[PDB]
């Protein structure tokens, strides 16, 4: 049976689903590299952990290349369609459509990037074709597999949302959610994967599938067209780097907020020498919470897609800005109105956007 900790001499795979880990491991065993295996794993997770990721979405794939020694990010984050508008999530009164309903609308669907990202990864580093790497997942989709507890829980929890679309025929056969151990069969997904295997990514970004996806998005109120799909490309992003406790950390830049604020929180907390406090002391949690409030406030004010907005990365990570933020934190009292700082004190330029309160 599968383990949540393992050791190996010639490589390692860790994923959220044992069947995906098995597929990735098999790729390495058969002489593939970490990129080959990662591509196979994404297809496998698309089938076995279908609520969490897949060719209908997007992601950030960080790769360290053992030959060149360069670290690169394939950024397959989705794009808003050309017909998207700044107010598309607002009602006629200019207030937000309630979140639980907003997420079910066609306006919510970004142009998917995952498949394009996988193609790019193989172009740069692949030693196995997409045809080879997608095959194990075609078989899981066509033949089925017994669902795990996390997937069973997800189908039950989101049954209402699934019941309103064609997804019901896959996850709610005969009107009832599949239970743990039940066989999930995804014949249409298998077909789509077979189309990708035969035709390449044009099977997804062009032709009948692109038309069908676009029409469906429009039927559900969104603006996506075939042209949006044809236009899509990934972006190659350069990691942001930080120094921490003798390590160099490579992490994700805008359009993710992750890297900046991971580094900002580490830099703020580094001043406090956390290990002096017991790992479950109130002191440690106090310092974490106070730091989180400051950094998440900055995130809400200053982070967005750098193709569009002036993210003050330099100011947000400036050691003197970090110092000013650290000085706002006390063990013995809580900031009850934490706010974004002014990183523009520590760098050139200004925001090309406003500070806008959100529901």
């Amino acid at each position: 049976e599968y383990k949540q900790v393992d050791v190996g001499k010639d490589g390692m795979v860790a994923t959220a689903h044992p069947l995906a880990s098995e597929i990735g491991a098999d790729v390495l065993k058969k002489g593939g590299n970490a990129i080959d295996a990662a591509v196979a794993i994404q297809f496998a997770l698309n089938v076995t952990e279908p609520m969490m990721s897949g060719i209908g979405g997007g992601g950030f794939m960080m790769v360290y290349d053992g030959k060149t020694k360069d670290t690169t990010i394939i950024d397959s984050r989705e794009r808003a369609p050309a017909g998207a508008t700044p107010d598309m999530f607002l009602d006629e009164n200019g207030k937000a459509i309630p979140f639980s309903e907003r997420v079910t609308k066609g306006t919510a669907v970004g142009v998917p990037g995952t498949l394009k990202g996988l193609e790019e990864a193989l172009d740069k580093w692949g030693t196995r074709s997409m045809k080879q790497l997608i095959t194990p997942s075609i078989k899981l989709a066509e033949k089925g597999f017994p669902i795990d507890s996390v997937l069973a829980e997800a189908i039950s929890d989101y049954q209402e949302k699934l019941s309103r679309t064609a997804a019901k025929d896959v996850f709610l056969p005969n009107g009832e959610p599949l239970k743990e151990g039940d066989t999930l069969i995804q014949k249409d997904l298998a077909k789509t994967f077979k189309l990708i295997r035969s035709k390449g990514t044009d099977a997804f970004y062009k032709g009948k599938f692109a038309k069908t996806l676009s029409d469906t998005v429009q039927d559900f109120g969104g603006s996506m067209t075939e042209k949006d799909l044809e236009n899509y490309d990934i972006t190659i992003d350069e990691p942001i780097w930080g120094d921490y406790q003798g390590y160099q950390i490579a992490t994700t830049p805008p359009p993710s907020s992750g890297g900046i604020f991971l580094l900002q929180m580490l830099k703020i907390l580094d001043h406090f020498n956390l290990s002096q406090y017991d790992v479950r002391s109130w002191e440690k949690y106090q310092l974490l919470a106070e730091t989180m409030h400051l950094s998440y406030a900055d995130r809400a004010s200053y982070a967005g897609d750098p193709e569009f907005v002036n993210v003050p990365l330099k100011g947000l990570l400036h050691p003197d800005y970090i110092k000013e933020r650290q000085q706002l934190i006390n063990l013995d009292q809580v900031n009850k109105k934490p706010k974004a700082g002014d990183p523009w004190k520590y760098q050139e330029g200004s925001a090309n956007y406003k500070q806008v309160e959100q529901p």
Partner: protein, 183 residues
């Protein structure tokens, strides 16, 4: 969202976070093709005017934080997690426990996490002491009455001295780590 990681014998290292936003995304499946569609654009601000407003051809702000840590110019640790805005906190805490506290990697991953992005939004995992939560709430925090799981960290550590790899999957899902020993 899901996070996974792979490392091979030639020194290549992958840390990959990937999502369709909500569980099952919009819930919309492309008819006859089986593909579940993301709701990623709700990661934009609903009210426009700010850094993360909706614009055509713009990408909505993410919190995905696939990360690789290096020591002496070699990759030694990968970290990442699902969990929306909480991702940054899960990755932060894993790094803090493994590096600042010197905890073994699995232990670092399993150490109970917290998350709070504002004065009205708090989460904690089972194991954060009840007396600590009481104390912090007494000071003005707003931790709730029940724990929740936060994130799902998969991580690989690489020992270049001994030529070995260690993989870790978080107990919050049924993940598996599988090492490779060729031949």
């Amino acid at each position: 969202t899901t996070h996974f990681t792979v490392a091979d014998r030639w020194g290549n290292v992958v840390s990959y976070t990937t999502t369709i936003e909500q569980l099952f995304g919009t819930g919309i499946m492309v008819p006859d093709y089986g593909v579940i569609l993301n709701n990623e654009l709700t990661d934009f601000d609903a009210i426009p005017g700010g850094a993360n407003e909706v614009q055509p051809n713009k990408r909505p702000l993410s919190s995905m934080t696939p990360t690789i840590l290096f020591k002496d110019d070699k990759p030694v640790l990968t970290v990442g997690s699902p969990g929306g805005a909480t991702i940054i906190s899960s990755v932060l805490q894993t790094i803090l426990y493994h590096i600042e506290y010197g905890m073994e990697l699995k232990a670092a991953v399993e150490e109970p996490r917290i998350y709070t992005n504002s004065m009205s939004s708090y989460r904690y995992e089972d194991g954060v002491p009840k007396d600590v939560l009481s104390k912090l709430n007494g000071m003005g925090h707003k931790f709730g009455t029940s724990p929740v799981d936060i994130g799902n960290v998969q991580s690989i550590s690489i020992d270049h001295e001994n030529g070995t790899f260690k993989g870790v999957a978080d107990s919050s899902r049924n993940g598996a780590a599988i090492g490779i020993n060729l031949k």
